Structure 1
Amino acid sequence: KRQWALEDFEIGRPLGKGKFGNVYLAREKQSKFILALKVLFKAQLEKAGVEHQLRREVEIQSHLRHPNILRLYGYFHDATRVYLILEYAPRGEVYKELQKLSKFDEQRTATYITELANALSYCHSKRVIHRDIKPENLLLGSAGELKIADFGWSVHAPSSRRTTLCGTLDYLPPEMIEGRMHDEKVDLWSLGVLCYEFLVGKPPFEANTYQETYKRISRVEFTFPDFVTEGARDLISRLLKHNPSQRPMLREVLEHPWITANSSK
């Protein structure tokens, strides 16, 4: 019922630069509740033509609540900018963790996969598919649990990381690159690419050129390093099926023996 304004927030340190503004660590003045305030410059939004996309995602995002989806508490604007009031993830970016460690062990990875499969299953129930779950779009909450970030198009790919185009291609299902129709099964594919990247430290299809990466995805050709265990190979292999129809249901990922044995939750 209450209406938010810039004055309601104590703006602390800048967390990073988006394409249309900055994101800041902030506190709501009364409750001192910590949150992330994302700023967007309207004229810039309009010129990039993302103005209506932003509105659609805000409407959709506003109805989503899940422990592993970064929460949109609300938003407001003045004549020049729009302000997104976002959940703050106190443990920062997964992608950085991934380079600090190079790759994640089976317990960490399987627990992450559980968290995401729950999130994606919830999304599907809300008719929301093809959520971006590549590492650069994953944050960490106060309990080390994954948080799927919102509005990934408004931020630049990490410099230290894969660039935007490469990053996105790395995670595209064969059906979407072969220009066919797609459905929820797209999320099973992303989960499989992620699981692989978490365990190995690089996505399964990445090659020197976009062209080769494209080719490899289309043919679903990749190899497991020797250190990937049989249970992980089984799950990843079931996820990275060319025919979307042969991919597991999310409940089947959640009950998969490698997940059950390795997950903390």
Structure 2
Amino acid sequence: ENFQKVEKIGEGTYGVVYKARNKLTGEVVALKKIRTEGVPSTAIREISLLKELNHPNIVKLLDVIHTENKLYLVFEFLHQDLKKFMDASALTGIPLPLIKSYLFQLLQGLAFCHSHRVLHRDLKPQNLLINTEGAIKLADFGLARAFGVPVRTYTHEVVTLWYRAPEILLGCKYYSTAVDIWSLGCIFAEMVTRRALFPGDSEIDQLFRIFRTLGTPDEVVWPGVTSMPDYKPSFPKWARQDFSKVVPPLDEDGRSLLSQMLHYDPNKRISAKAALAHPFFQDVTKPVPHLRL
């Protein structure tokens, strides 16, 4: 109504995303339309709280619009997402200093969200947005918390499992901030090697891809694992792969940090705050990406 619907910039996890121009402000924004029983009031209040979340590494949520018994989220617009940039960059790779800058910024964003008791739980390259200024920002949180997580995306789209933490796959009902660190670890590896770390095509394939690389978890490395809801004693037992085979040719600082983000036990997994202190970031800078828009 008040927007020009420049274009449809994608099909998001909770619904379609459009680029739109505000006729009033002349502002260009990203408009997300969400799924019809009249909607929960709980989600509206929860999501509305998110407008308050402000940080250079988080995509700004400008407005929540509930009108006509519909739900729209109005976000600040960024021109490119990391998935597109990695594809664009697949021939030459993303330079390490830019990988490092992006990881550092994403951890700052997570540290902020997590200290505010906000989880993403859906992280993936498609929801990490970048600009010409060298910034990267976390988008499209859901919140899967304010909302909930049904079978498909919106209409017949296939959910990506590649970034899902093992505790989610094993049926843990209570997610912690550790799930976001796991996903970001997977994204870090993918920037480095230029292929997804764990590209599972099903929940069990996702789980077994993890096990084949990191070893099948046991009570030694992950106390309580064999009691998890979906754990089966019949899981094959794979040996852990020497870690230098996983993200060559990343240096030992990077491998060390990745290994800490990928710990099986969510309690041992490094926090975003602790990760920012890791020696990998001693030389961090903020390079300009080459973006073709």
Residue in 1 that maps onto 2:73: 84
Q: For 1:230, which of 230, 237, 252 is the aligned residue?
A: 252
Distance 2:203 2:170 in 1: 14
- 1:95 matches 2:83: yes
AA aligned to 2:178 is: K
Aligned-residue sequence identity (percent) comes to: 30
Mean Cα deviation higher: 140-149 or 229-238: 140-149
Aligned to 2:234: none
Structure 1 residues 147 and 164: CA distance shift in structure 2, 3 A: farther
In 1, are the aligned partners of 2:59 and 2:138 still within 8 Å (CA)? Answer: yes
1:174 aligns to what?
166
Match runs of 1:43-82 below 5 Å: 45-46=35-36, 55=44, 58-79=47-68, 81-82=70-71
Aligned twin of 2:21: 27
Q: CA deviation at 1:119?
A: 0.8
Structure 2 CA distance, aligned partners of 1:258 and 1:20?
A: 35
**8 A contact 1:117–1:254 mirrored in 2:** yes
Does 1:136 find its partner at 2:118? no
Q: What secondary structure does 1:95 align onto? A: helix
Task: Give the alignment partner of residue 195 of structure 2, picking from 188, 196, 202.
Answer: 202
Mapped to 2, the partners of 1:31 and 1:116 lie a distance apart of: 30
2:60 & 2:124 partners in 1: Cα distance? Answer: 18
Greater helix proportion: 1
Counterpart in 2 of 1:105?
A: 95
Quote the residue 1:249 is aligned against: 271
Tell me the number of residue pairs that the alignment of Structure 1 and Structure 2 aligns: 247
**Deviation readout 1:159-216 (Å, 9 max, x if unpaired):** 9xxx743x22x22222222233442222222221111111112232335665343123
Letter in 1 for 2:116: K
In the alignment, is residue 217 of structure 1 matched against residue 207 of structure 2? no
Q: Is residue 114–residue 263 contact of structure 1 (8 Å, CA) maintained in 2?
A: no
| Ranges in structure 2 where 5+ consecutive residues have no aligned partner | 216-240, 288-293
Aligned partner of 2:236 in structure 1 is none
Q: Which whole-Å deviations, capped at 9, do the CAs of 1:63-112 have from their partners, x for residues lacking one?
A: 211212111111334436433221101x2121011111124221111111
Q: 2:185 aligns with which of 176, 192, 212?
A: 192
Q: Output one character per residue of 1:104-129: Cα deviation in whole Å (capped at 9) or x when no partner.
A: 22111111111111111111121112
Q: Which segments of 5 or more consecutive residues in structure 1 lack a partner in the other structure? A: 1-5
Distance in 1 (alpha carbons) for counterparts of 2:11 and 2:88: 22
Amino acid at match of 2:95: D
Q: Deviations over 1:14-72 (max 9, x none)?
A: 333458864333333343222123334xxxx226x975685355224222112121111
2:51 partner amino acid? S
TM-score of the two chains, using structure 2 as the length reference: 0.71
**C-alpha distance in 2, partners of 1:134/1:17?**
14
SS at match of 1:244: coil
**Does the Cα contact within 8 Å between 1:120 and 1:131 map onto a contact in 2?**
no
